[PDB]
Design a protein around this ligand. Structure first.
Ligand SMILES: CC(C)(COP(=O)(O)OP(=O)(O)OC[C@H]1O[C@@H](n2cnc3c(N)ncnc32)[C@H](O)[C@@H]1O)[C@@H](O)C(=O)NCCC(=O)NCCS
Ligand SMILES: [Cl-]
Length: 163
């Protein structure tokens, strides 16, 4: 018996009730879960790295075995650095599936010890994308059903600072 450490990479911009569901579910079949926020150094996200990790920690803080780190670089190197068992990914949109199968088969060429595991979210979380959430918030639309309160207020305070 070893001790399992799954990495859950994402821009998490912002974290969604979807992401929360998956991380809870992962937290039950793995010893450590690392919520790994991509800095996206050349990607251009809406929430600062600090904003994102905050909203993450706010929503999943109460889970003993969940850690939160930022990271940039190849996900493969981050994987090796973290002596990770496997990389956690969620499946729901079919176009999802073909890229996930590609990023999984490709990273494995880079590091043979590389592993993806996949979860499906609750049918109530399957339609939620960070991107759709941004665009609904962006147009002064209610996202309380789709993201944690933390994030609701956080949108209200990009609106207070303009937007
Ligand atoms: C794919 C990258 C960009 C981040 O993933 P993504 O942009 O999809 O992030 P997102 O914030 O949406 O969350 C990530 C994960 O959560 C899942 N997810 C998002 N919303 C939901 C939801 N409502 N329900 C279930 N799962 C969900 C996604 O399908 C994904 O598996 C990430 O792997 C990365 O930045 N990699 C580093 C760059 C790299 O090395 N690239 C080439 C070699 S890997
Ligand atoms: Cl909530």
């Amino acid at each position: 018996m070893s001790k399992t450490r799954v990495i859950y990479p994402g821009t998490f911009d912002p974290i969604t009730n979807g992401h929360v569901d998956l991380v809870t579910r992962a937290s039950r079949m793995f010893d450590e879960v690392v919520v790994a926020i991509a800095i996206g150094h050349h990607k251009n996200p809406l929430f600062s790295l600090e904003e994102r990790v905050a909203l993450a920690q706010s929503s999943l803080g109460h889970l003993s075995n969940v850690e939160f780190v930022g990271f940039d670089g190849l996900l493969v190197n981050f994987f090796k650095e973290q002596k990770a068992t496997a990389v956690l990914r969620g499946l729901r949109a079919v176009s999802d599936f073909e890229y996930e199968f590609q990023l999984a088969n490709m990273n494995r060429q880079l590091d043979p010890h590389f592993e993806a595991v996949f979860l499906t979210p609750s049918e109530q979380y399957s339609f939620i994308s960070s991107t759709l959430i941004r665009e609904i918030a962006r147009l002064k639309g209610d996202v309380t059903k789709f993201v944690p309160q933390a994030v609701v207020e956080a949108f209200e305070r990009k609106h207070q600072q303009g937007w």
